[PDB]
């Protein structure tokens, strides 16, 4: 009845000093009268400093605080693959609730060394630039960084679309289950987004954990942890997961704020310190696992949107140092229209080689380096004036290759297409052409192969990798095609 | 061009049923409630389940 | 210093940080009860202004307020350590606060072993209950009183609202 | 129910309401208020005490004084009868024209609509200003934030927007003078009257004016926005409206919140800014939308705090901005009213993937060309056009035509433009510039494009000359 | 009522009454109806205005081979 | 003695002991938390209540719970069996191969060894890597902090050193992966495993690994520091050893301290810090030494928040060091690895004496040229050229060659670099730059100097770079 209940000792600021229920199991989400849950974070003796899920407007004091007697868990399952939920795994989709009714403590930890297994994986993005230059393997926490839906977000889509190929393929590792933790992203933003993902029907292998620009702060805050709990499920259940946290900048904000409101200070940048732990605890749980975990993965794509490219920015520094690289995107370039827009100098996978795909590596590995120089002379050299043809070419060629790393948004690829177009540049074929025509070339080039060199694609696909032979066929394609492509 | 033509009807029958549901429901609940306590046995069913707490939660 | 002794209820301390002193103090020397009754007495022995309201009047010198409010009067038979704690709450101004210490206290030898569950209407009514057995039901029967819609309601006691609450 | 003044430390009025503590957000009207002083429950501090906020002035706060719960948040007129009317925050004729009655009054806490309940997919509200739509596509339900040179007929323009849009579109308007200069609003008042955008004769104006000027205490200044919202939702859903919500000036919101926070025992985070800044912001932002029926499109005067926009507050704001407007003196100087510098008239949601490619491209061509022409403004500044070729001449000329062509005359500031204004549907608009791009009208007078709304009247006008 | 199904009954017979009125369940009344009238009309705005109770028929033509 | 947890406000665990409080620092075993929840007494809060700290986290705790003093501070397994193992604080097998069965136990506390009991003035441990030794020669048994933004190949670099050096080194080593990505530690593990130096067949290795990862609750990360110390001390003195002590990252440690400082009911500090930072460190760093009994050359990786050094914590840090490796984010940013700011990475320990003057001087000229050279760099940067002095040009270029010459690619990590470019034994190093000082090389390239090893080969590369 009210058998064992407690009275809201005080309330103001969404911080419910709660009298009673005293023997609360720690970090129990409890329930107040108001429907509302809170989680009893703070056990002071005489009261519970209670972080309130939902908000204090509702609230009236002395109100019954019921144990919920439950420690924070979030629902876990897979029926959310095909769903949008709020952070508590309750829908918001309005389809009624998810079939996923299993729950799982978000209070979980990142596995040990032995559990884990290192990468050697590729992990395909369908974004050429990305898998090539910031080559991706599965399990990895890596920073997606870019400045104000500068297509930042777009990226995630192309990859997801790329995972389509896997989940729509049959992948036993590449079948990357996407968990989209949407942090702070306004309802419109999300609503909008979702609408697309569903359209991308990628939603089927996709969870969307949703903290829009409406949430109570812990909720926004919580959302990743929710996601965190879930993705490890796949990972550990062999299944290969992808989580997009977008973005922790907001989460942190909420969280600091949460502290602050809790009249708990912060440190640096007004941010508390173990927000480092926050991200660590959050992110370390994304990993590439040993076989005991079905080998699986939770590949973590945290997103931090640089604020003004600022990263020295303590929390960014933090995240950066956690991530095994960053993909910084050159937003002005984006704005130059360049989509992708990348700041590849500022895009790194320190890793590099464990994370790549041989098909691509065969042209791209080599290219990356070569580009290292092109780019290098794009920047290094910088006048009006010409150098030598080599470099001049490198610039021209490079520039061509630049188009190639673009990808009019929402258009990822399977590996051979990428490699294909790349072959064309690397192997000298389209140094020739111009950007205006690159883009065109590619279109044509694809329809050409699409029609024709499906064989070859077949091959490349087969080996997952190039063959000189395939190359020889390629060689022909490009040359000939190239000729067809203009004339 | 056909589809729009059927879908109004569906979508209206969906919205209509909710608007009958909420209005039924609200009017329904707002009429009948009170007579409940004059069943003291709504506190006897509290006592009943409460005696099957009171034996049967120990 | 001492070591912890706390009569059943027991409390949380804090304006009962004193209570707890005597939840060890009274308790020890087991004039637990002497004082237990003292307190009761005190309560109304207290309640009227005088040399008490004295304090309020800031300008009355606490120093001698104790020697007046407690000298002749609060030692009228409130003394053991009882006047001294009076004279402590006195100093420590916890005099206006004292009722609550009694409150707090008084659930003590009896009510020390109180009755809690939060239960509709005039809910529990601090008594005593033995958790192994039911005690609950009994009580209810005793009465066919309280108020339960005005007093605690069919929403708690049996969800009048809940059926609303699903939607 | 009653409250006592238990503590006044300013307008944080510690009220002890002792007949329970009505949920935070409840409006109380304080009893003993000659100056009907509403307190909003902010915290239930306990002790049957709440911390409450004056949204009004004080004195004669004779202690223990009696305070009355209205049992709800502040209730304010909702319903159409507000149009043409200026109410204070607390929903009362500061038009000083007797009751701004409505039919329904509303407790003004009412927040963040469900994501599904929107038509989750939003759509440009057609302004008709060529430049406007073109450069910053304005979304029904959206937040567009108006950065802009001062007094430049920001207002003039705005008035005109009401005319074209709130008129031509079903657009209604709300003016929320948040912390504005009462005086400018006064001036404006007369201006509005004058402009006829507001009308008295009939109060069937498109705009209800709500002012919660500098005069208000922050809570009031802060809150005039929810109020304004509360109506706008009313119209939006209820009157199905595309409401135009002029929230003028949002900075004053931020400012109002931020101030209180500290005092409010809330850490007002970075820069002083209320730690909730975003949440405040968010909860509010989520109320701005094309729901299903109606859109509340927020036309946001945005003072550029510290002209700084990394400025956490603006940073947040960015999230809230679909389309961003900086009004530009540079342009203005060119006599071009619109004074819009278009490069600052964007929508983040620009793309051809998003803002689709003719528009975009024509535009791309335009921003580029105009700039390129601007590159030439430096280049020409040296070399003269003589040293440039006709594509440059062309571009210049076109750019220039285009330049003029963004100029659309004004009924209002016949003083600035020189005359009565127009209206321009989009197809014609883009076509217009596209046409100029086709160079069609040779470079038959380009000053023709000056202060002409549709492109044709200029073509025609070029002819009357030629 | 809390032989709990009696609260379902409590509701249910007022469903029984309401559904055993006309329109099935009504008493929603004209105010509901103006609301309906808008969204039912407003639907048509998105959606076109003709054969929402009959079959629409269509036509097939060409300009030129430009 | 027993307490019951009375307040849990996070992993600051307030235990009210209902009777006797053992002195502060007693490791307590919580009666209930099988999640071996050591609480370390932190404060005697008064009235038999202690503030104790969970190392661990807390969810599920009933406010109530009984805590039984483990009766001492932490006892940890010590001795050699910790070599080739992953120990946490408690020396548990994060090797995950079962225990780290020792004889010896330890209070993870240890204190500063007597000043006289230290060695007084140490002797250079050369650092191999040309740039490095040259400008920063180290002392055998030295404490070096490597300031550097983590993870910039920062971490890579340390590993590479380890590679060169720790390999080159015999003795033993202690490795503490604190707060670092478990993921990297995982790889590393396997890498060591692989290396077989993490012997897969010795419980030992030659290296003990101690971990206090980021994802941990603070106490664990915090305290692993003492632990690691205890072990290394164990080896240093007891095993008489030349221990190498690798720490990544003290920054996270320091941070851990600071983070708690607030929660600890203390004031945090400037920037939030632990205001006790200094005492903590002073005492800690003084726990560190190379006494006579052995020597610990401790290579301590330092993440420097936002690379702010200025930032008081690093400001403090400096005291503790006697060799600083200050990495230039800019140089790193030039890709240039070596990336160091070496006019900031310092040792007074470079000497005309100890390092002989040649080296030394060669360096002084270098330090100098470069030091001047930066100064302009900026001016000229915008202020372009020539209506100037071209002797300067000479230095600039030269500086640049030298600059490049410091660079050596990440030899091993072809995965990161694809490049090799070796280590330069010291005379060859001195020679190298000296030769550049002789400036003969100067009509030559610039990236020849980049990412290599022996100047001869670099020269070779110069020629070659000259096509």
Curated annotation (Swiss-Prot), chain A:
Phosphoserine modified-residue sites: 10, 40, 100, 118
Binding-site positions, Mg(2+): 153, 246
Predominant location category: mitochondrion
N6-acetyllysine found at: 57, 60, 66, 95, 101, 164, 173-174, 195, 239, 361, 368, 432, 440, 465, 473, 475
Modified residues (Phosphothreonine): 68
Quaternary assembly: Homotrimer. Component of the ATP synthase complex composed at least of ATP5F1A/subunit alpha, ATP5F1B/subunit beta, ATP5MC1/subunit c (homooctomer), MT-ATP6/subunit a, MT-ATP8/subunit 8, ATP5ME/subunit e, ATP5MF/subunit f, ATP5MG/subunit g, ATP5MK/subunit k, ATP5MJ/subunit j, ATP5F1C/subunit gamma, ATP5F1D/subunit delta, ATP5F1E/subunit epsilon, ATP5PF/subunit F6, ATP5PB/subunit b, ATP5PD/subunit d, ATP5PO/subunit OSCP.
Function comment: Subunit alpha, of the mitochondrial membrane ATP synthase complex (F(1)F(0) ATP synthase or Complex V) that produces ATP from ADP in the presence of a proton gradient across the membrane which is generated by electron transport complexes of the respiratory chain. ATP synthase complex consist of a soluble F(1) head domain - the catalytic core - and a membrane F(1) domain - the membrane proton channel. These two domains are linked by a central stalk rotating inside the F(1) region and a stationary peripheral stalk.
Name used for this protein in its record: ATP synthase F(1) complex subunit alpha, mitochondrial
Swiss-Prot record, chain C:
Post-translational modification: Acetylation at Lys-139 decreases ATP production. Deacetylated by SIRT3.
Molecular function terms, GO-annotated: proton-transporting ATP synthase activity, rotational mechanism
Record PTM N6-succinyllysine, positions in chain: 67, 77, 135, 139
Modified residues (N6-acetyllysine): 31, 37, 47, 50, 77, 135, 139, 149, 153
Alphabetic keyword roster: Acetylation, ATP synthesis, Hydrogen ion transport, Ion transport, Membrane, Mitochondrion, Mitochondrion inner membrane, Transit peptide, Transport, Ubl conjugation
Localization per record: Mitochondrion; Mitochondrion inner membrane
Coiled coil stretches, renumbered: none
Function: Subunit OSCP, of the mitochondrial membrane ATP synthase complex (F(1)F(0) ATP synthase or Complex V) that produces ATP from ADP in the presence of a proton gradient across the membrane which is generated by electron transport complexes of the respiratory chain. ATP synthase complex consist of a soluble F(1) head domain - the catalytic core - and a membrane F(1) domain - the membrane proton channel. These two domains are linked by a central stalk rotating inside the F(1) region and a stationary peripheral stalk.
Protein's recorded name: ATP synthase peripheral stalk subunit OSCP, mitochondrial
Shown part of the complete sequence: 24 to 190 of 213
Curated annotation (Swiss-Prot), chain D:
Residue numbers binding ADP: 151-156
Ligand binding (Mg(2+) 2): 180
GO CC term (a single one): mitochondrial inner membrane
Broad EC category: translocase
Gene Ontology biological-process annotations: proton motive force-driven ATP synthesis; proton motive force-driven mitochondrial ATP synthesis
Binding positions for phosphate per the UniProt entry: 151-155
Entries under SUPFAM superfamilies matching the protein: C-terminal domain of alpha and beta subunits of F1 ATP synthase, N-terminal domain of alpha and beta subunits of F1 ATP synthase, P-loop containing nucleoside triphosphate hydrolases
Keywords, in A-Z order: Acetylation, ATP synthesis, ATP-binding, CF(1), Glycoprotein, Hydrogen ion transport, Ion transport, Magnesium, Membrane, Metal-binding, Mitochondrion, Mitochondrion inner membrane, Nucleotide-binding, Phosphoprotein, Transit peptide, Translocase, Transport
Reaction catalysis annotation: ATP + H2O + 4 H(+)(in) = ADP + phosphate + 5 H(+)(out)
HAMAP family the record matches: ATP_synth_beta_bact
Protein name: ATP synthase F(1) complex catalytic subunit beta, mitochondrial
Organism: Bos taurus (Bovine)
Curated annotation (Swiss-Prot), chain E:
Family (UniProt): Belongs to the eukaryotic ATPase subunit F6 family.
Organism: Bos taurus (Bovine)
SUBUNIT field: Component of the ATP synthase complex composed at least of ATP5F1A/subunit alpha, ATP5F1B/subunit beta, ATP5MC1/subunit c (homooctomer), MT-ATP6/subunit a, MT-ATP8/subunit 8, ATP5ME/subunit e, ATP5MF/subunit f, ATP5MG/subunit g, ATP5MK/subunit k, ATP5MJ/subunit j, ATP5F1C/subunit gamma, ATP5F1D/subunit delta, ATP5F1E/subunit epsilon, ATP5PF/subunit F6, ATP5PB/subunit b, ATP5PD/subunit d, ATP5PO/subunit OSCP.
GO CC annotation terms, alphabetical: mitochondrial inner membrane; mitochondrion; proton-transporting ATP synthase complex
Protein purpose: Subunit F6, of the mitochondrial membrane ATP synthase complex (F(1)F(0) ATP synthase or Complex V) that produces ATP from ADP in the presence of a proton gradient across the membrane which is generated by electron transport complexes of the respiratory chain. ATP synthase complex consist of a soluble F(1) head domain - the catalytic core - and a membrane F(1) domain - the membrane proton channel. These two domains are linked by a central stalk rotating inside the F(1) region and a stationary peripheral stalk.
One record GO biological process: proton motive force-driven ATP synthesis
Compartments where found: Mitochondrion; Mitochondrion inner membrane
Transit peptide among keywords: yes
Record protein name field: ATP synthase peripheral stalk subunit F6, mitochondrial
Residues bearing PTM N6-acetyllysine: 6, 11, 44, 49, 64
């Amino acid at each position: 009845d009210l058998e064992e209940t407690g009275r809201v000792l005080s309330i103001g600021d969404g911080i419910a000093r709660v009298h009673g229920l005293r023997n609360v199991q720690a970090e129990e989400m409890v329930e107040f009268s108001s429907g509302l849950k809170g989680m009893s974070l703070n056990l002071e003796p005489d009261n519970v400093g209670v972080v309130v899920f939902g908000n204090d407007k509702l609230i009236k004091e002395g109100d019954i605080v019921k144990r919920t007697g439950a420690i924070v868990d979030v629902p876990v399952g897979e029926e959310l693959l095909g769903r949008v939920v709020d952070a508590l795994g309750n829908a918001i989709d309005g389809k009624g609730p998810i079939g996923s009714k299993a729950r799982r403590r978000v209070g979980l930890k990142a596995p040990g060394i032995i559990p884990r297994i290192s990468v050697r994986e590729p992990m395909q993005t369908g974004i050429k630039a990305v898998d090539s230059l910031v080559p991706i393997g599965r399990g990895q926490r890596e920073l997606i960084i870019g400045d104000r839906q500068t297509g930042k977000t777009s990226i995630a889509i192309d990859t997801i679309i790329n995972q389509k190929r896997f989940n729509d393929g049959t992948d036993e590792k590449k079948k990357l289950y996407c968990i989209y933790v949407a942090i702070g992203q306004k309802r419109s933003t999300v609503a909008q987004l979702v609408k697309r993902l569903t359209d991308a029907d990628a939603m089927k292998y996709t969870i969307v954990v949703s903290a829009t620009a409406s949430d109570a702060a812990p909720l926004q805050y919580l959302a990743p942890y929710s996601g965190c709990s879930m993705g490890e499920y796949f990972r550990d259940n062999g299944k290969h997961a992808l989580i997009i946290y977008d973005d922790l900048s907001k989460q942190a904000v909420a969280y600091r704020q949460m502290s602050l409101l809790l009249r708990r200070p912060p440190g640096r940048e007004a941010y508390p310190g173990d927000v480092f732990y926050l991200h660590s605890r959050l992110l370390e749980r994304a990993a590439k696992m040993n076989d005991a975990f079905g080998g699986g993965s939770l590949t973590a794509l945290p997103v931090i949107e640089t604020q003004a490219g600022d990263v020295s920015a303590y929390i960014p520094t933090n995240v950066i140092s956690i991530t095994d690289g960053q993909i910084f995107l050159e937003t002005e370039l984006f704005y130059k229209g360049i989509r992708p827009a990348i700041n590849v100098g500022l895009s790194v996978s320190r890793v590099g080689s464990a994370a790549q795909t041989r098909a691509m590596k065969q042209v791209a590995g080599t290219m990356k380096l070569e580009l290292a120089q092109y780019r290098e002379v794009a920047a290094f050299a910088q006048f009006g004036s010409d150098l030598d043809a080599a470099t001049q070419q490198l610039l021209s060629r490079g520039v061509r290759l630049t188009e190639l790393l673009k990808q009019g948004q929402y258009s990822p690829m399977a590996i051979e297409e990428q490699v294909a177009v790349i072959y064309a540049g690397v192997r000298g074929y389209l140094d020739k052409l111009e950007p205006s025509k690159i883009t065109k070339f590619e279109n044509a080039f694809l329809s050409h192969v699409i029609s024709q060199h499906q064989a070859l694609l077949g091959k490349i696909r087969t080996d997952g990798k190039i063959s000189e032979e395939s190359d020889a066929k390629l060689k022909e394609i490009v040359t000939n095609f190239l000729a067809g492509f203009e004339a | 061009e056909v589809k729009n033509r059927l879908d109004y009807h569906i979508s209206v029958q969906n919205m209509m049923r909710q608007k009958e549901q909420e209005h039924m429901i609200n009017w329904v609940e707002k009429r009948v409630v009170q007579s409940i306590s004059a069943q003291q046995e709504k506190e006897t069913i509290a006592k009943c389940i409460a005696d099957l707490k009171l034996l049967s939660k120990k | 210093f001492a070591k912890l002794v706390r009569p059943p209820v027991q409390i949380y301390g804090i304006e009962g940080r004193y209570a707890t002193a005597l939840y060890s103090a009274a308790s020890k020397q087991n004039k637990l009860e002497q004082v237990e009754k003292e307190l009761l007495r005190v309560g109304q022995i207290l309640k009227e202004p005088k040399m008490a309201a004295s304090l309020l009047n800031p300008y009355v010198k606490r120093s001698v307020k104790v020697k007046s409010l407690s000298d002749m009067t609060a030692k009228e038979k409130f003394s053991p350590l009882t006047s001294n704690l009076i004279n402590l709450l006195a100093e420590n101004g916890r005099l206006t606060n004292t009722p609550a210490v009694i409150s707090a206290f008084s659930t003590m030898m009896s009510v020390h072993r109180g009755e809690v569950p939060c239960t509709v209407t005039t809910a529990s009514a601090l008594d005593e209950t033995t958790l192994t057995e039911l005690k609950t039901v009994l009580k209810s029967f005793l009465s066919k009183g309280q108020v339960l819609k005005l007093e605690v309601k069919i929403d708690p006691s049996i969800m009048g609202g809940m059926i609303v609450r699903i939607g | 129910t009653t409250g006592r003044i238990v503590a006044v430390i300013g307008a944080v009025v510690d009220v002890q309401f002792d007949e329970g503590l009505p949920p935070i957000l409840n409006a109380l009207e304080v009893q003993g208020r000659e100056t009907r002083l509403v307190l909003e429950v902010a915290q239930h501090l306990g002790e049957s005490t709440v911390r409450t906020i004056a949204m009004d002035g004080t004195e004669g706060l004779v202690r223990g004084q009696k305070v009355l719960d209205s049992g709800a948040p502040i209730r304010i007129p909702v319903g159409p009868e507000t149009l043409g009317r200026i109410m204070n925050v607390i929903g009362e004729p500061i038009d000083e024209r007797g009751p701004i009655k409505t039919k329904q009054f509303a407790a003004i806490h009412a927040e963040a609509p469900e994501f599904v309940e929107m038509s989750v997919e939003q759509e440009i509200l057609v302004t008709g200003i060529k430049v406007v739509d073109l450069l910053a596509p304005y979304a029904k339900g959206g937040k567009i934030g108006l950065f802009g040179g001062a007094g430049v007929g920001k207002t003039v323009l705005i008035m005109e927007l009401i005319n074209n849009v709130a008129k031509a579109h079903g657009g209604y308007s709300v003016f929320a003078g948040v912390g504005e200069r009462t005086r400018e609003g006064n001036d404006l008042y007369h201006e509005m009257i004058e402009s006829g955008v507001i009308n008295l004769k009939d109060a069937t104006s498109k705009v209800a004016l709500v002012y919660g000027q500098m005069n208000e205490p922050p809570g009031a200044r802060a809150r005039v926005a929810l109020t304004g919202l509360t109506v706008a939702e009313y119209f939006r859903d209820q009157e199905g409206q595309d409401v135009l919500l002029f929230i003028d000036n949002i900075f004053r919101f931020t400012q109002a919140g931020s101030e209180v926070s500290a005092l409010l025992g809330r850490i007002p985070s970075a820069v002083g800014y209320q730690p909730t800044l975003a949440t405040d912001m968010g909860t509010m932002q989520e109320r701005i939308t094309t729901t299903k029926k109606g859109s509340i499109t927020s036309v946001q005067a945005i003072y550029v705090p510290a002209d700084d926009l990394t400025d956490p507050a603006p940073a947040t704001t960015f999230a809230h901005l679909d389309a961003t407007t900086v009004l530009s003196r540079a342009i203005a100087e060119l006599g071009i009213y619109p004074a819009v510098d278009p490069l600052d008239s964007t929508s983040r949601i620009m793309d051809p993937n998003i803002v689709g490619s003719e528009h975009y491209d024509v535009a791309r061509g335009v921003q580029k060309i105009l700039q390129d022409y601007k590159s030439l403004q430096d280049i020409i500044a040296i070399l003269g056009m003589d040293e440039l070729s006709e594509e440059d001449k062309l571009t210049v000329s076109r750019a220039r035509k285009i330049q003029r062509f963004l100029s659309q005359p004004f009924q209002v500031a016949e003083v600035f433009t020189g005359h009565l204004g127009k209206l321009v549907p989009l197809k014609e608009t883009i076509k217009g510039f596209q046409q100029i791009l086709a160079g069609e009208y040779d470079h038959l007078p380009e000053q023709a494009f000056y202060m002409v709304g549709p492109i044709e009247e200029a073509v025609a006008k070029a002819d009357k000359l030629a | 009522l809390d032989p709990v199904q009696k609260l379902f009954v409590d509701k249910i017979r007022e469903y029984r009454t309401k559904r055993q009125t006309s329109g099935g369940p009504v008493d929603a009344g004209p105010e509901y109806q103006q609301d309906l009238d808008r969204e039912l009309f407003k639907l048509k705005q998105m959606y076109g205005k003709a054969d929402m109770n009959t079959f629409p028929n269509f036509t097939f033509e060409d300009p030129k081979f430009e």
